[PDB]
Design a binder for these strands. Structure first.
Lengths: 38, 136, 141, 286, 61
RNA sequence: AGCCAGGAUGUUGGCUUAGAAGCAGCCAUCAUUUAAAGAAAGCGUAAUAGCUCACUGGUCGAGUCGGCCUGCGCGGAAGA
RNA sequence: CGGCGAGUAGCGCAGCUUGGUAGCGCAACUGGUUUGGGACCAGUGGGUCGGAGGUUCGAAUCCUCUCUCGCCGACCA
């Protein structure tokens, strides 16, 4: 899990969600795309 | 960085930045980067935009540059009492009216051209946009 | 041929036995013996050519019995043999290597058209003609 | 007899006692071998396997009180030349000590091929017209050969050469048994820098074994250490990795290879030839 | 210090020898001889004459 | 957008004869079988393979998709 | 960051007031004298003034800002 100020859809199994006001990106294919801020 | 040979004055007054554009088109080619916000470009940014514009398109194709300095902003060094004269020549900056194109790109499809400019806009302190070609 | 478990596409060197640098463990990833596949295939090089890069389609059952399906040379190295110029592209649209007509190329296209998988014979030749313009070569007409 | 450790026990002191006891441990078995280096002034000790190599020195810990540390070969690797220059001059005019001391020689050392026979180093005498007489033919070679030792590319000897000199001048009593001899050295020292000559490396060939398919395990650890993978020798089961890796990236080779292969390997290596070294890896030499 | 004669030895920097006296006088004060044949000093190569000196044992064949 | 299926035969695509064989590097990216399936899309094998998708069947069965110029907002936003 | 001081060949300097020609002493090199190096007795080669300018009848010279090396002060509390 990385913090950023810019999430970017990195994988193709990257998903975008907005759990509790914060834009999370969860790649179930890959832990190395997991990020939140934005 | 691109800087003038054989100027008339080394030092230039301050000045402001009011007004709108002069060059408001794509003129030399078809694909350009047009300034929507108003801000100041120094020359190294103009070098670093182009230098990180070649490897976006892998040096192929042609790129046209419309702009240049000759607003020499001077800046005092560290630790001065205010005024013994004007500051020393430090670095070139190039004023921008809103609506001027900055780089013009040709020899490449629009498909890589809309993708090569997104790496450029963060090498400029202003906001830009991408304009394609207009007839008449 | 059974289902794909240890199915590969292999044999970079037909006339030379045990292609050890490029292929190497490419059959050896299962651990399958090469000492009997050579003596089975030395018995099947009696009627076909030698010293040519001819690939193989090899499938084994669950009980160590293996099966090959050998074929003619593929079309992109057919320029090296039917024209006699052992060369490649470098940059293929801007390259010259040679030129051969389709009327000279068809003499092996009698021997391979029974062996390939197609439904028009003059269109399996077009698997070499469009190959030829894609591998640096031009064809006479 | 293919696994190895070494010694650098405070770099001179303990080596004055301990190596004799290796010979006192060499009557125990004829497999107790050591590799003597004078490139590094070291003795690289072998063993047998996991059980022997740590109790090789552990017997010397209690019964001899040594301070041995397992070391690495740090070597001279080779050097060679690149291009030639046909105008240097042996211009000295010293005066004291006797009658006179003048010399003059024009020094031309020529680049031969890196793949050569033992005729790859020579003294090809191409003098003309009696500008230098034939009673100088060994000493002009003697002044030439003396700069091979401390050649100032961080001090290494250098091969694949050939010298073809042209021009000089000599007096009645000035030119001596020494006058050309220093003129054929310090001037030949100035023919040395201007070629941009090359640093080298002692190329060895790889023969690490593999059960049937283990190329997916070694593909890092030798490719960091300069692997030129030229294939395999293929059998029914046992296949063997064959590449080209020089000596001085076996820093921690013997004690880290079994960390990779699930604890199952036994390597061997053999040294062939001279190839070159670029300045990125030649930076780590001085 | 001590001189070694003959041709061919086996010394590497830390070997046991036994030194006897008798100077050689071409060096001002290198004042001994190593008795070749002392506890590692291998037999000198092929002395068929004066085998008492240098310790070489009986050319049997 | 799914639900079950093909998801390629030809051929290592001459290269790079590096280990490069849909897939390290330059380039060229023909087409046939065809109702249709890039001589390659994401990984992923050391490279095969494995796993998936485009492009394409049957079904469900009504709207659905990517950018543009704009309203007021969310992130960016820690201090004694 | 700032005064005074200059850059003339490998080395070091008059040419600069008030712009006009690039000389000079000692090295590299060669010769005379001697049997020979060194010395003496004489010569040859060696720069277009760190560099970019503008100015101008022509610039080392005239001025300005930079590269570098000196030197002067960088202070009260």
């Amino acid at each position: 899990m990385k913090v950023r100020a810019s999430v970017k859809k990195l994988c193709r199994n990257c998903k975008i969600v907005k759990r509790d006001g914060v834009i999370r990106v969860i790649c179930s294919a890959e832990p190395k795309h997991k990020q939140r801020q934005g | 960085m691109l800087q003038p040979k054989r100027t008339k004055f080394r030092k230039m007054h301050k000045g402001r930045n009011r007004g709108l554009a002069q060059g408001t088109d794509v003129s030399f080619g078809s694909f350009g980067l047009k300034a929507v916000g108003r801000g100041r470009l120094t020359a190294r940014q103009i070098e670093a935009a182009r230098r990180a514009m070649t490897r976006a398109v892998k040096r192929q194709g042609k790129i046209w540059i419309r702009v240049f300095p000759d607003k020499p902003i001077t800046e005092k060094p560290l630790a001065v009492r205010m005024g013994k004269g004007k500051g020393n020549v430090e670095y070139w900056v190039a004023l921008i009216q809103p609506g001027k194109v900055l780089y013009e790109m040709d020899g490449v499809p629009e498909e890589l051209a809309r993708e090569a400019f997104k790496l450029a806009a963060a090498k400029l302190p202003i906001k830009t946009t991408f304009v394609t070609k207009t007839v008449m | 041929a059974k289902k794909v478990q240890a199915y590969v596409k292999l044999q970079v060197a037909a006339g030379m036995a045990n292609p050890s640098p490029p292929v190497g463990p490419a059959l050896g990833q299962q651990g399958v013996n090469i000492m009997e596949f050579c003596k089975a295939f030395n018995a099947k090089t009696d009627s076909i050519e030698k010293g040519l890069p001819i690939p193989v389609v090899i499938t084994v059952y669950a009980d160590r019995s293996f099966t090959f399906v050998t074929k003619t040379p593929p079309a992109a190295v057919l320029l090296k043999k039917a024209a006699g110029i052992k060369s490649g592209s470098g940059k293929p649209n801007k390259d010259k290597v040679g030129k051969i007509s389709r009327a000279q190329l068809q003499e092996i296209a009698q021997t391979k058209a029974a062996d390939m998988t197609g439904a028009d014979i003059e269109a399996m030749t077009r698997s070499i003609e469009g190959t030829a313009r894609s591998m640096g070569l031009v064809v006479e007409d | 007899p293919v696994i190895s450790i070494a010694v650098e026990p405070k770099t001179k002191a303990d080596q004055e006692k301990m190596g004799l006891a290796l010979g006192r441990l060499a009557k125990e078995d004829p497999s107790f071998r050591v590799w003597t280096d004078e490139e590094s002034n070291q003795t690289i000790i072998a063993g047998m396997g996991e059980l022997h190599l740590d109790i090789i020195v552990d017997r010397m810990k209690r019964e001899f009180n040594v301070e041995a540390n397992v070391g690495k070969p740090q070597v001279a690797y080779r050097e060679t030349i690149r291009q030639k220059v046909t105008d240097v001059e042996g211009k000295h005019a010293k005066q004291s000590g006797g009658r006179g001391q003048y010399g003059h020689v024009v020094i031309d050392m020529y680049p031969l091929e890196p793949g050569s026979n033992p005729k790859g180093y020579e003294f090809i005498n191409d003098i003309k017209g009696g500008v230098i007489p034939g009673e100088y033919i060994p000493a002009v070679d003697k002044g030439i050969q003396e700069q091979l030792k401390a050649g100032p590319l961080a001090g290494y000897p250098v091969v694949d050469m050939g010298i073809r000199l042209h021009f000089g001048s000599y007096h009645d009593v000035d030119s001596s048994e020494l006058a050309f001899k220093l003129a054929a050295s310090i001037a030949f020292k100035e023919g040395f820098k201007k070629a941009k000559p090359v640093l080298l490396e002692p190329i060895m060939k790889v023969e690490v074994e593999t059960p049937e398919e283990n190329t997916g395990d070694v593909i890092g650890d030798l490719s960091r250490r300069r692997g030129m993978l030229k294939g395999q020798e293929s059998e029914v089961t046992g296949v063997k990795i064959h590449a080209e890796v020089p000596l001085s990236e076996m820093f921690g080779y013997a004690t880290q290879l079994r960390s990779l292969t699930k604890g199952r390997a036994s390597y061997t290596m053999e040294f062939l030839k001279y190839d070159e070294a670029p300045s990125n890896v030649a930076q780590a030499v001085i | 210090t001590s001189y070694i004669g003959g041709e061919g030895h086996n010394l590497q920097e830390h070997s046991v020898i036994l030194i006897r006296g008798g100077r050689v006088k071409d060096l001002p004060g290198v004042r001994y001889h190593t008795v070749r044949g002392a506890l590692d000093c291998s037999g000198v190569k092929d002395r068929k004459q004066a085998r008492s000196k240098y310790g070489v044992k009986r050319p049997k064949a």
